[PDB]
Structures are given as C-alpha cells and as structure tokens.
Design a binder for this molecule. Structure first.
Ligand SMILES: NC(=O)c1ccc[n+]([C@@H]2O[C@H](COP(=O)([O-])OP(=O)(O)OC[C@H]3O[C@@H](n4cnc5c(N)ncnc54)[C@H](O)[C@@H]3O)[C@@H](O)[C@H]2O)c1
Ligand SMILES: NC(=O)c1ccc[n+]([C@@H]2O[C@H](COP(=O)([O-])OP(=O)(O)OC[C@H]3O[C@@H](n4cnc5c(N)ncnc54)[C@H](O)[C@@H]3O)[C@@H](O)[C@H]2O)c1
Ligand SMILES: NC(=O)c1ccc[n+]([C@@H]2O[C@H](COP(=O)([O-])OP(=O)(O)OC[C@H]3O[C@@H](n4cnc5c(N)ncnc54)[C@H](O)[C@@H]3O)[C@@H](O)[C@H]2O)c1
Ligand SMILES: NC(=O)c1ccc[n+]([C@@H]2O[C@H](COP(=O)([O-])OP(=O)(O)OC[C@H]3O[C@@H](n4cnc5c(N)ncnc54)[C@H](O)[C@@H]3O)[C@@H](O)[C@H]2O)c1
Ligand SMILES: [Fe+3]
Ligand SMILES: [Fe+3]
Lengths: 869, 869
C-alpha cells in the first residue's frame, strides 16, 4: 500500500496501469457518475484538507485554501462535465471524418507545496473524466495533504463504479523516486507544476509533458482606471492565500498621473510603504542564495518584517516598496510568493508596458499579466497591451490570483490551476490546462472522391452562318471597343473583315493585331497587351486557332493584370483548384469571345493556352478556367477553304484530344459521351474532308464541330501524355502539334494500355487501371469489333484504324520520316523527356510515366517502332 | 556561412534569433507574400531536389519524390494560406476574450533521409506563416539536398520582404552538434521526425517537442471490400517512393473469404509471393542486428532479392510473404520501409482487427491504420475499427502513403508530413502537424460581471382575505389531490380547515401532515414523503412558516425524486448555477403552493429550506430555485392572533433578512429597493404589532408583507453571516432563529462595517467594500440622521435604533441573558465557528470572515460586548 521505495513504485504503476485498461472500456454514463462522486467527496472535504495543508505546509491561510479546494471541484465540474471525451466527438459525414478521442494512458502528477490539495483535486478529477489514470509525486512539505486529497477522491470513485488503485500517490517522495517515475516506460505523460527546474526536468525525462513554469505578474494601472478597485483587487489577490498562489500580482506599474493617489489608497487599506531602512532590510530577506527565501513564502505580512528586523500592524495585508530598478539586481521584483509587492513609477502608459514587459521578461516570461483601465473606452490600450506583452493571459480589470484560474471574473476562460506559460516559458501548451490535453484524438478518414466539374464558356454557337448572328447577339448588345486578334493569313485573306463588317455597321471601334505566327511567343503576347493597354477595349476577339486563341486569352491577362509574371502563370500544379498562383478574376475590363477557323485545337472552349517562353523555347501550356473564352464561336464557313495538311493535323489532334480524355483519370460521365461523339464523327467525316474538302462541306463542318466537342471533353478531363511530349517535340523541332500527336498516339495507347503498369496517378476516383478497357469501349463505339473479342484485339483494331487513318492523310510513319535527324534527336531527347514529365498535361495520364519510359516511346517513334514493354 | 562546428552553430542561432525578432513584427500581408514566393520557389524546384535527393540518399525514385516536393508546397499553401496566425484570431465581445496568437520563436528541424526535401519545404514553409524561424539538423545521407531545399526557400523569401538568415541549416551534421542545438537555450521548440531514438531524444532535450515516431501500418481487407482497388491502392502506396515513405502499408490482414482472390490479384499486378526458400532468405536480410537493413530501405523490389540471393522480374512492384506469426520473432512484420509486404490470414473481421492491433502494437503504435470495406453499408465495422485500433489515423478505403499525408483522398485532414502518432508512440500531439502547433495563443480576459437574477414564485397574493380567492384561482382550476403540511398548533386551532373548507366544496382530496415541530428534522421529512408517495398528490400546500415551509418544499423533493441523498442535497457551493448536485426539475408531479402565518421567515418566496440532519443536529440550509413555492400566498388574517414573541423573533429576522441583503455582495438594484421598503415598514409598524397586536391589524399586516418583501430580497441577494451562525447557535442551544439573529446583527454590522477588512469575497460586481456606506444609505432611508453626518454616526444611529427596537420587544442584551451557560458555550464555540464558515449563507458576506473573527463576535455577544477589531 505504501510507497517509499523504487520497487513499490514499479509495483504500484503496474496495479495502476491495469486499472486504466479496465477503466478505458468505460462508457460516458459509467464515468459521468465517477466524475460527480469524486467532486462531491472533494467539495465536502474543502475545510479539512485546507487544515491539513497548513499544518503540513507551514504556509497559506485556511479560509483562502478552502476557496481553492472548492473551486477545483465545483468550477471544474460545471465546465468539464458535458465535455464529450469518451468516443466520437464529431462526425462530418459529408466528408468522412470522425474524431474518437481515446485516452492517453496514465500520468505523473508533480505537485507543489503552494497548492498541494487543489492541484490534486484538479488533476485527479480531470484525469477521471478523460478515462485516464494518474500518479502523484508530491512536495515533501505537503506529502500528507495532497495524498489525503486523492484518497478522498479515489475512495469516492471506486464507490461509484471504478477500480481500486486507478489513482496512486507517493508517500515518502524524493528525486530518486520521481526521476524513476518520470522515466518509467509504462508512463505515457507528465502533468507537472512547480516552476523552473521542474519543467526543465519534466520534458528532459523522455516523455511528453504539460509542465508549467511560473513567475512575475506585472499589473499596470493607467490614468484611465478605477484606482479604487484597481487596489482592492490588488490586495484581494496578494493576501489571498498570502500570495503563495501563482499568478499573483508581484509588481504594479503606475503612471505618474495617479501614483500619489494610488500610493495613499494602498496605505489606508492596509498598505505599509517601505520607505527607507525598512525597504532594504525587506529586499534583503526575500532573495537568499540567488533564490527567494523558502521560509517567507505564503507567510503573512507582519511575519515578514519580523524576519526583516522591524514590525508593523498585524492587520497589514501587504508590504509595498517604491522602487525604480527593474532588473535582476532588485530582488523586490522577482517571483516573491509573499504578500509583498513592488510599486513602479512610469511617465505614461507606453512607458509602463515597456517596463512591465521588461520584468515579466526576467522571471515570469509567458505566465500572465494584468491591466487596469477603461475596459470599454480604451480598446487600443488593450490592443497595445496584448500585442506587446508576451503572456498567455492578459487580465484586464481582473485580479490575477482569481482571474488566472478563470471562471469567476471572466468566463470563456478554461478554469484551471496548472496555468500554461507558453514556449516563452518552456512549455508547449500555451493555455490553461484541461482534459482535452490529456486525450488522444484520432481521425478516421473515409475515401472521398475528388470533386469535378463540367465548366464551359456559356454561349457556344455552332452552324454555318453564325458570326453575325452571334456578334449582334451579345457583343453589339453591350460592348463598344474591340480588339480582334488573328494572324496575317486571315487578315490578308478577308477572314477579319467578315467580323469587323458586322461590328462596324454598329457603334464599335475595332483594332486588329495580326503579328501572331504559329507557336506564339511571349514577345508577341506583350506586344498585344502593350496595344490593348492603349486601345482600352471592352471586348477581345480571337480568330484562327491555337496561336491566336492562345495568345489572345493570355493577352487578356496582361491587359487586366499586367503585374502577372509568366514564370508564375505557367507553374505546374498538382490540382487545378489547389493552385498556388490563383489566376485573377478577369472578366471585368473586357470579355474574350473567341472564333475558330482551325478544327483540332478546340482552344475556343478550354482553359488551355499554349505559349513558349521565347528564351528557352519551351512551350508552357498554362491552364485555368478563368481564361475561358466567354462565348466561344465555331462557324464552319471559315474552314471550307483550308488546305489538306491543316485539316489532317487538326482533325488528328482532336482524335488525341478525345482518346486521351476518355481514358484519362479525371474522366467522368459528362466528358465521356462528348469525347466519343467526337471520335465517331472524326471517323465518318474526317477522311472525306481531307480528300474532297469544300466539296463535302457536310464533313468539313462535322469535323469542325467534333474538334470542338473534344474541347468540351479535354477542358474538363485534361489531356494525357501525348501532349506533354508533343509540346516539347513540337518545339525543339518546330513540328506542328497535330503531326506530333499522330506519331505518338499509336505508341502511347499501347503504353497506357497495360493493366499492370509500373505506377499510377493516385486519383481517388481512379479505382484501378481501366485504360486497357477504357480504350476498348472506344473501338466498340466506332464499330471496329462487334463479335466477342478478347479486349486485346479491340485495341489492335483501334491502332490499325489509326495507321490506316494516318496513311490516308499523308501522315508519315515516324519522325525520322518527318524531317528530323538522328544526330539532333538522340542528343536532346533526354532533355525533352524530362521536360515532358514536368508538363501539366501528364499529371492526368493514368500511368504516371517514368522519364525512362517516355524516352523509350520517344525513340520507338523516331524509328517507327512499337512500345512493347 | 558554413556549419560544421559547435561555435558556428552558436553564431548562426544568434543571427537567426535576430531575424525572428525582426520577422515577428511583420503583418499578415507582409508574410502572406513571403509564403507564396517560398512555395513557388519550392514547386518550380520539384524536379531537381528530387534528383539531388536520390543522388545523395541512394534511395527513393525520382518521379515519386516530385509528388512530395510538390505536395509539400501546393497542398500546404492551399490550406494554411488563409489561416489567421498573426494577431487576433477571434474576439467574443459579449464575453471579453481575444486570441492573439503570438509566434513561438525558433525551431530545430530534425530531418530524415526518407523525405529529406519535402520535410524541409514543409517545415520551412510552415514556419514562415507562423512568423517563426527554424534551423535544420539533417541526415548525413541527405545533407546536401534538404539544405538545398531551404536555400531555394529562403532566397525566395528574402526576395519577398524578409531577413537574410531567418532560416538556417547544418551542412556537416553529427550528434555532438544536434545535441548541442536541441539543448541550446535560445531555441524554443523542436520539430522532429525520424522514428524511435529521435523522439526519445527530442523530448529528453529540455525543450518542448512535436517529435514524431513511426512504424507498421496494418491494412484490413474484409469480405465486403473491393478487392480490385484494395490491391491497386496497396501497390500505389508501397511502390510510391518504394515504400520509403512513412505510413506505407507494411502488412495486410485478409480474411479467408477473399484471401485466394486477393492472393492472385496481387500476383497478376506485380506481386511475387515468396513461397518457400525465397521467403526465409527475404526475412533474413530485412532485420540486421535487431534492426532493419539500412541498405534495403527505399530500394526497389528486384533489388531486394539480389541481396536475398534470388531474382525476380524488374517489373515486380512488391514482395509478398504469406505468414502467420504476428510477433517480433517475424522480421517480416516490423517497419520495413521497403516495398516488401506481409499478407496475413484471418478467419473473419474481428479476428483480423484483433491481429492488426497486435502488430501495430509492436512497432507502429499510434501512427496509422487502414481498412478496406464497404465504406457506406458497413459503418459498424468502421465504428469497430476506430474504437479498437490505437492509431491517430484510420484510413478507410484510402491508401496510406497518400492518405496519411491527407488532402488528396480525404479532405478535412490536415495535409502534412510529420504525422503525429499520439502519446501511444511517445508524442503529445495526436494529429497531423500544422502551423497552429508552432504558435503561442494568448487570451486577454476582460472583467465580466457575473450574471444575476430576480426570480420569484409567480402568483404571489397578498391582502387580508386571500386564501379562498387564491386557491379557487389556480389550484382548484387544475389539480385534484392535495397534501397540506403544517404543525399541530395550526391543525388544532382551525388554521387548516380554513384551507380545506375551500378545497372541499370542490373536487379535491386532502390529507394533512401535522407532525412538524420547530426546527424540522430529516426524520419528519421522510415521514412526509413516505406519506406523499402513498397519497400521490397533485399539489402540495404549506402553512405556518419555516418548519413547515422548509419541510414541505423538501418533502416536495423526496416525492418527485426519492433517490435524493440529503448529504448531496445540502452540499455547500461557491455559485448557485455552477452547482455540483444540480437539483432535479420538480414541478411535474405536484406543485408547492405555500401559505404563511409567521412573518419573518419569508420562506414562501425563497429557495432556502433550513432542516437539520437529526444525526449531527446541524441545520443544513439548502438552496436552489427549483424548490420555490410556485404561487406563494401571504394573508394577514393568519397572524393577527400570534403571541408577542413570535412577532418579535419574526419581524426581527426580517430585519436581518434585509439588512444583510442590502449590504450583501450579490446585491443589485432589483433587490435593494425591496429590502429598504421592508426595512422602512418594520420600523413604523413593528413595535405597534408587538404592543398592540390584533388591535392594530394595519401594522400586523404590513409587517407580514414586509417580512415577505425581504424574501424577494434575500431570495436573490443571499443572506450574510448572521444566519451562518444563527443556524448553528440556534441548533447547539435550540435558540429560535429570530432571537439569534437579533443578538448578532448589532455586532455583525460593525464587523462588516470596516472599509479595511482582512479579506473580501472576490465578486466581480463587488468593486470594493461598500458595506460601511451601504449601511448608511439605510439609516438615511429610515430617517435616523438627515443633517450631514460623518457616515460613522449613521451607523451608531442604526445600531441604536436596533438596541432600542430590541429593547421594546423583550429581546435580551446577550446570550448569557438568553438561557445559555458559559460552560456549555466556551466548549462548543470553536465547533460552531467552523461550522458557520462552512455554511452557504456566509459565501455572500462582504468580508469573508475568518474563523478567528466569528468566534470573537460570538463571545462578544454572550457577554453583551461590541466587536471593535
Ligand atoms: N502555474 C501554476 O498553476 C502554479 C501553481 C502553483 C505553483 N506554481 C509555481 O510553483 C513554484 C513554487 O512551487 P514550489 O514552492 O513547489 O517550488 P518547486 O516546484 O521547486 O518544489 C519542488 C517540486 O518540484 C519537484 N521537483 C523539483 N525539481 C525536480 C527535478 N529536478 N526533478 C523532478 N521533480 C522535481 C519536487 O519533487 C517538488 O514537487 C512557484 O514558482 C509558483 O508560481 C505555479
Ligand atoms: N488545349 C489547347 O487549347 C491546345 C492544345 C494543344 C495545342 N494548342 C495550340 O494549338 C496550336 C495549334 O495550332 P492550330 O493547329 O491551332 O492553328 P495554328 O495557329 O497552328 O495555324 C497554323 C497555320 O494555319 C493557318 N490557318 C489557321 N486557320 C486557317 C484557315 N482557316 N485557313 C487557312 N490557313 C489557316 C494559320 O494562319 C497558320 O499559318 C499548337 O501549336 C498550340 O499552340 C492548344
Ligand atoms: N511520421 C512521419 O512524419 C515520418 C515521415 C517519414 C519517416 N518517418 C520515420 O522516420 C524514420 C526514418 O528513418 P531515419 O531516416 O529517421 O533514420 P534514423 O531514424 O537514424 O534518424 C536519425 C536522425 O536522428 C537525428 N538525431 C538528432 N539528435 C539525435 C539523438 N540524440 N539520437 C539519435 N538521433 C538523433 C540525426 O540527426 C538523424 O537525422 C523511420 O522511422 C520512418 O518511419 C516518419
Ligand atoms: N428559507 C428561509 O426563507 C429562511 C430564512 C431564515 C431562516 N429560516 C428558518 O425558518 C425557521 C423558522 O421557523 P419560524 O420561526 O418561521 O416558525 P417555526 O417554524 O419556528 O414554528 C413556529 C412555532 O410558532 C407557532 N406558530 C406558528 N405560526 C403561528 C401562528 N400563526 N399563530 C400562533 N402560533 C404560531 C407554532 O407552534 C410553530 O411551531 C427556522 O428553522 C429558520 O432557520 C428560513
Ligand atoms: Fe491537341
Ligand atoms: Fe432569517
């Protein structure tokens, strides 16, 4: 039963550990009942413990401890009784979160002599609500009391449905014993108290800790304060337990304006101002051996002077010494737990808090500070006192001894002894301790599918003869200044009068910018914003496709936000809503209506805008749904006179826009029927549009509509990896986009079409690799294989249809065959296989390629081979 | 610039410390901008660091680190960018709370080799948002990378409005150096990572810590799971960085129902089942010297077998060994950071989680666990997996490697590396680390006045001839069974037919209980509830006063809640809403209409109900507003035949009911005008009612109304200390209440009437002692002293009026004169001076008496003296 040896300890802990494991399986009602019985047993025993605390400690006063043994039970209960601390605290079912709050284990309670019983009723009683255990290592001066404070708690818990040794205490303490308890393995936490050396040794143990320092507690009394209650509260805080209590106001800092008044008001109401010889004698007994006399602590005032060598009335509550030094040389400013007090003299407020912060900074860093002022009309002072004072508790118009243990003067403050002083003091709690610190929360995280979107430009218009019907719809009914962006071949050949012809004839002012060439550079973009910033357009228009529709919707940026650094605008990301350079909201200065005369790109719908740096020459595909065209237009009358090449490269980038959008990882049921309806039109009408041309406008139109439909697909289901390398392959060699996508898709399919790949994209919605299947759902949709095929022929037949399609469009079989030299390829292939993996298009490819696996399907194309793996 | 010495460290830290102090004074915009620049600089450098991390670490794979260096910047930013962490977080102005969130200081970042760069971009970047600093102590294998990961962060912050050495790193690390950094004083925290030994030495330093262990991560696959994604996600988690990443699924636990299926599905998709000789050879290289081979970590699978002595395809993602042992003897179950994996065989779910909990309990206690099942239709399994598994993260249908660092598969989970494992593991964080852990919150607590009340029984009726008018008002219009409580003198003398006369004549069933005598005991109460529980009344009535009206409203308790233990019902409290035994809501079975024939008590309004234990004989005044009479009645026709004594003792307890209610600490402006209007009527009409009696019914009525008015006062403004001793003085000697209150009030006034008292009640509303003034506002209200008196004569004149009043009512001058013997007083005076301080009435007396100060004004009354102090 008794504990004065190191083995008795190692036995106790075990018969305790085994209580917890039996106590942890308890419910809320089975412990809500243990919590009351232990709190009553502690309240009804408020007087005796307070007697047993003075007989043994030699300090304190009875009637002021009784407020503590009682506060530590009633004011603890009213607060932590309804705190759900057993199981599920919260359950957000929209998400998949649940907080379950298992306990922590067992604890070591390091008790002081200052508050031996309250600090025990407080920990004992709070460690039962969290379904924990605890073991006390008390102070020799108060071992009999704080251990009689737990038996009065335990013997009332076991009587309420608890085990019989859940709690434990050391009877004959030491260092060899505590240091053997704090370092015990079956312990799981340390709940300490007692100032420096204590916390310096709690954390240093090896276990966690909620140790708690302590020290000075400056209090400031400004001109705009109620010097009456400022003083009573100063005395009601020192004399309370004779200041032995922590946080008590060891030092006031008054401003000259009201010093004399305060000086007297302290005198009349039991204040002896240490004027001369008395003072020195008093600041000589305080500090013994660099520390405060361990015999003066908690003792009444008149009992101070006797040790000093003088005498004062027995009714004196306090001993005040008017001083100026605010450093360590003055022992009259350290953490004297006596009723003594230091009275400083300051010019104004700012001069005080500068002085307070200086003497909290010496012994009481982080603990608490106080202020007395107009709590309602001087909120800036407050704001200036909280932002300047490095204390975890700033107590405005409250006494510290009864506001730091806070449920009396202020609510919303966690009632507690064991007041955290923040890392400033050497403890990482920063708050009044409670049961939510003795607790191991834990979070079950159900798989949540990542949110998706089908976002387009409103006002898509599509048929032959749709320009004037559209401009005169939403543009002219509205804006007044336009900026048509296009290329020369369209400005020269009357593709841009057909649009000004309509704006003119109404009130509008046009200005065309036609210095855009294939693969636009950032130099052309600036030059376009440099113009937009002069013409100040109310709207922006973009013709052709790709180069214009990619230079314009970015010129739309530099016009509304010229501070945009392309280096940050083209930063590769991992998710498009968790973007690190969130695009600015740009639809205010001007809109970005878009027209297209080129089939494939589909840029008229999608956020993508491919441009190159003009310094490194790397195409930086940059993406955000803020640069959607805002009323795209797609008229098939601007395509019927296209050459045979641009038709192929276009309609053949659209194929690889849907192919790697039906198979992508962001694919959905919204973007999977459009991709197919595109891929089914590019099969019935694409060859015709190449051979026949304008002679079959029915086909030249569908292809134009399809290539846009893919946009609806790959605007939401981003591209795959064929573009991540086609952008680089089409830059280091100036190969066109569509021609590059054609020389890879018949070797990229068979890359992604492995159900046992080396990697995978880590997308929640992506259960497992479906690409091999997601590619056969294509063939069966086109009509390649009806009868019961292996799912591997449906692919061979998909490729075959491509090699057949790439044949009857003049597409070469390889790059070598496309105007590239093995000497210039092998050299800068490792460079653009890395710069491909670092593209934003590849973050959606189902297989998450390895640099060592793009290089291979990048050589196998130069030599017209097949990636076999 | 460089750091390979212990002094270079002590210099670095200083030029860092001085950055913080300059960085702490920064605003939100001045740091919201530092946070971006550092996150971009880290994202754009996602590839190289991943290269620099493999060249130097020898482990990992490039394309999987890049997801980390990028997650640690983008997914960190999107989450902690809007987190207010600079100043005021919250401001509840109704209360007086403000959370200001000063920073913590500077930090030591202990980095592993597993995640050298991400763990640096994560800490570096999160320590800038909290306006902190940090210093890294990296792993020798990865010193060049994680230090190149901070310069890429710092040099981008200083370029955004920051100092030039805010961050720091060690180039040539050691133990002598870290151990000298962790123990450095100017440090304020430790942000560690690296498993056991690390955290065992972080906390052991002397500073706080958020160190983070690590270990096994069981994953359970039940019958009702999607074995397809269960597997892909198992591989997508191991092969990811080659399992080197923490939290990865080191062990699966499948149930027989689907084991064979899972066994194959693992095989087809890159799973080599270690069947025979291969297995042993494989579980022989894992653990070297009791620990795992530090060369196998992060290495690919096929590179495992080579060390084992066999070979497998290069495309194998994983190495699986079907085993049964679940203890330490099997090294195939420890925290192997390799792509290896253990496959266990279980009968059913419960048999698995019992097995998982056993192998998390060995090396990975607290870190995280996983489960694959129907996340929607099997919520009990979930509930059973979270309540049973001691892990801070339970991952349902998510892969661990990409769900523990959680913003991808589940949201609402704090994205973080540095995953806390809870005290189970040896760290008191219990949660994924973030910036709110690197932060010192602090709470300004403005003085809030404690809420008060003016709560009475509705339906107070008062005039001559008010019984029948009242009973036939709300009782008969309603209830049907009554229980009149009274004493014999009223039952005998027809005071109780006057009330049944009216109930009868209507449909009601009466039963009278008249075994109540003065100073009722708990035996009489039970005997009354023992009756009420038989008659089952719909209403309760109480006549006379005190004894009945105090035994009935408690018999009202035992009737509606017979489980009430008087020991808890009479427990002294510190506040009446923070009560530790909250009374039950008792107005459902029966009401408690009350009548009174005795003036003083005023119990017909107030919650008080004085009764004695009958064992110790101590009057336990118990109080709660739940036992208010619910339609009190006060008719003056039941008093006009009272004797001369009861008139005095009554009207003279009412005096001390208002006197110590206008001066009390809970006094308010609601209860201060009633107290006076009582105290002004007991002065004009009390003497008359004594001498004349029924001959002056005008006076006999007012006194009856006044004595009730005081009830309105001291029901809300509790009594003082005259009752806390009159209850004991009237019990140890059976002196009547009013006679005791009269022999003390003319010595208690001059007790509370000291403006420099020894103590004070600690009530916020009580600025300072006003009693000396609050007693003179009385005299001036009665008419004792009009002309400009000293405020000390107004008291002498108040007392004089009392000694004069106590004279013309036959009240003796002292107790000695009242039938008490010095031999029996001096003996049991120390006993009832303590049992007075332990009364609930004294908790409202302005002076908070000392036991040594009640004894004195308790002897000074025996000898008819004056308390002088
Ligand atoms: N912040 C609070 O809530 C609070 C409450 C009470 C007291 N205090 C502070 O406590 C201090 C006074 O308490 P004291 O009078 O107990 O001084 P103290 O705490 O030095 O007394 C020593 C206590 O700490 C233990 N202790 C000391 N050094 C130790 C070590 N190296 N290893 C293990 N245990 C060790 C002893 O066993 C004993 O319990 C004052 O500074 C006061 O402000 C603070
Ligand atoms: N997601 C996207 O939005 C996305 C994806 C990939 C590539 N791109 C961009 O698309 C570009 C492709 O360029 P494109 O194929 O869009 O058009 P393009 O701008 O390459 O035009 C190429 C040539 O075709 C000419 N041309 C355009 N329309 C014509 C017409 N109707 N009649 C005759 N000649 C015409 C142009 O004048 C130019 O000389 C790529 O280079 C890249 O910048 C965008
Ligand atoms: N939970 C997480 O956030 C997380 C993430 C990744 C890895 N991990 C864990 O980290 C560990 C990785 O292995 P490691 O690379 O940590 O090897 P290791 O465990 O030897 O780490 C040693 C580290 O300890 C540091 N150190 C400083 N003072 C020390 C002292 N007094 N004693 C010992 N070490 C001291 C060294 O500088 C070195 O960096 C594994 O346990 C892994 O699970 C955890
Ligand atoms: N809850 C409160 O409001 C409150 C406050 C202070 C004290 N008290 C308690 O009230 C009790 C006092 O009871 P009381 O003194 O009010 O009366 P009492 O209950 O002592 O009994 C008074 C006696 O006087 C006689 N009596 C009563 N009414 C009479 C009448 N109308 N005519 C003739 N004789 C009559 C009866 O014999 C009766 O027993 C004490 O226990 C005291 O502690 C209550
Ligand atoms: Fe394309
Ligand atoms: Fe009374």
């Amino acid at each position: 039963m008794a504990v004065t040896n190191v083995a008795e300890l190692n036995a106790l802990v075990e018969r305790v550990k085994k209580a917890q494991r039996e106590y942890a399986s308890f419910t809320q009602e089975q412990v809500d009942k243990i919590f009351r019985a232990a709190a009553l047993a502690a309240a009804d025993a408020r007087i005796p413990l307070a007697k047993m605390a003075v007989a043994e400690s030699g300090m304190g006063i009875v009637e002021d401890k009784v407020i503590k043994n009682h506060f530590a039970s009633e004011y603890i209960y009213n607060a932590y009784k309804d705190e759900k601390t057993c199981g599920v605290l919260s359950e957000d079912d929209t998400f998949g979160t649940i907080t379950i709050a298992e306990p922590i284990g067992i604890i070591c309670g390091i008790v002081p002599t200052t508050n031996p019983t309250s600090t025990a009723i407080f920990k004992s009683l709070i460690s039962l609500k969290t379904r924990n255990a605890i073991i006390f290592s008390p102070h020799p001066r108060a071992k009999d009391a704080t251990n009689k404070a737990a038996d009065i708690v335990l013997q009332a818990a076991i009587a309420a449905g608890a085990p019989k040794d859940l709690i434990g205490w050391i009877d004959q303490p030491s260092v060899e014993l505590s240091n053997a308890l704090m370092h015990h393995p079956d312990i799981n936490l340390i709940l300490a108290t007692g100032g420096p050396g204590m916390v310096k040794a709690a954390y240093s143990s090896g276990k966690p800790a909620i140790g708690v320092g302590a020290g000075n507690t400056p209090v400031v009394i400004d001109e705009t304060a109620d010097i009456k209650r400022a003083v009573a509260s100063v005395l009601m805080s020192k004399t309370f337990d004779n200041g032995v209590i922590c946080a008590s106001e060891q030092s006031v800092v008054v401003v000259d304006s009201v010093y004399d008044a305060v000086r007297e008001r302290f005198a009349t109401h039991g204040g002896y101002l240490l004027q001369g010889k008395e003072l020195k004698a008093v600041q000589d007994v305080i500090l013994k051996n660099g520390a405060l006399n361990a015999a003066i602590v908690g003792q009444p005032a008149y009992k101070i002077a006797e040790l000093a060598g003088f005498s004062v009335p027995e009714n004196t509550k306090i001993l005040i010494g008017e001083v100026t030094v605010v450093d360590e040389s003055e022992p009259f400013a350290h953490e004297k737990l006596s009723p003594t007090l230091a009275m400083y003299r300051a010019k104004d407020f700012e001069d005080a808090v500068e002085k307070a912060e200086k003497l909290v900074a010496m012994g009481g860093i982080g603990h608490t500070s106080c202020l007395y002022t107009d709590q309602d009309n001087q909120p800036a002072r407050v704001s200036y006192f909280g932002q300047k004072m490095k204390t975890a508790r700033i107590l405005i118009n409250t006494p510290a001894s009864q506001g730091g243990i806070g449920d009396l003067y202020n609510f919303k403050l966690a009632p507690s002894l064991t007041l955290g002083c923040g890392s400033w003091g050497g403890n990482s709690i920063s708050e009044n301790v409670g049961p939510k610190h003795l607790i191991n929360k834990k979070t079950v995280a159900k798989r949540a599918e990542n949110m998706l979107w089908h976002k387009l430009p409103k006002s898509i218009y599509f048929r032959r003869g749709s320009l004037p019907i559209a401009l005169d719809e939403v543009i002219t009914d509205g804006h007044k200044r336009a900026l048509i962006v296009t290329d020369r071949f369209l400005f020269n050949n009357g593709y841009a009068d057909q649009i000004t012809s309509v704006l003119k004839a109404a009130g509008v002012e046009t200005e065309v910018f036609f210095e855009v060439e294939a693969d636009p550079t950032l130099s052309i973009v600036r030059k376009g914003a440099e113009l937009a910033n002069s013409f100040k357009p109310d709207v922006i228009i973009a013709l052709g496709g790709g180069s214009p529709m990619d230079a314009a919707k970015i010129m739309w940026v530099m016009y509304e936000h010229p501070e945009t650094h392309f280096e940050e605008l083209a930063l590769r990301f991992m998710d498009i809503r968790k973007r690190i350079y969130k695009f600015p909201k740009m639809g205010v200065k001007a809109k970005m209506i878009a027209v297209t005369t080129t089939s494939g790109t589909g840029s008229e719908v999608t956020p993508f805008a491919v441009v190159t740096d003009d310094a490194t020459g790397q195409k930086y595909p940059l993406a955000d749904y803020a640069l959607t065209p805002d009323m795209a237009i797609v008229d098939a009358n601007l395509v019927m006179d296209m050459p045979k090449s641009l038709c192929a490269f276009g309609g053949l980038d659209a194929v690889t826009h849907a192919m790697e959008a039906y198979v992508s990882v962001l694919a959905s049921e919204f973007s999977d029927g459009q991709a197919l309806q595109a891929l089914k039109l590019l099969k019935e009408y694409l060859p015709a549009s190449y051979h026949e041309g304008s002679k079959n406008p029915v086909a030249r139109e569908r292809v134009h509509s399809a290539a846009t439909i893919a946009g609806i697909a790959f605007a939401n289901a981003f591209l795959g990896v064929c573009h991540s390398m086609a952008h680089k392959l089409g830059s280091q060699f100036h190969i066109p986009h569509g021609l590059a996508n054609a020389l890879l898709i018949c070797n990229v399919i068979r890359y992604n079409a492995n159900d046992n790949p080396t990697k995978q994209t880590a997308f929640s919605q992506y259960d497992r690799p479906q690409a091999r299947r997601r590619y056969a759902e294509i063939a069966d949709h086109l009509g390649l294989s009806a009868p019961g095929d292996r799912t591997a022929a449906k692919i061979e037949k998909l490729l075959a249809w491509l090699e057949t399609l790439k044949a009857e469009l003049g597409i070469p079989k390889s790059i070598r065959e496309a105007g590239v030299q093995e000497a210039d390829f092998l050299a800068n292939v490792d460079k653009l296989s890395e710069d491909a993996f670092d593209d934003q298009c590849t973050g959606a490819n189902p297989r998450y390629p390895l640099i060592s696996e793009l290089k291979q399907i990048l050589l196998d194309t130069y030599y017209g081979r097949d990636y076999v793996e």
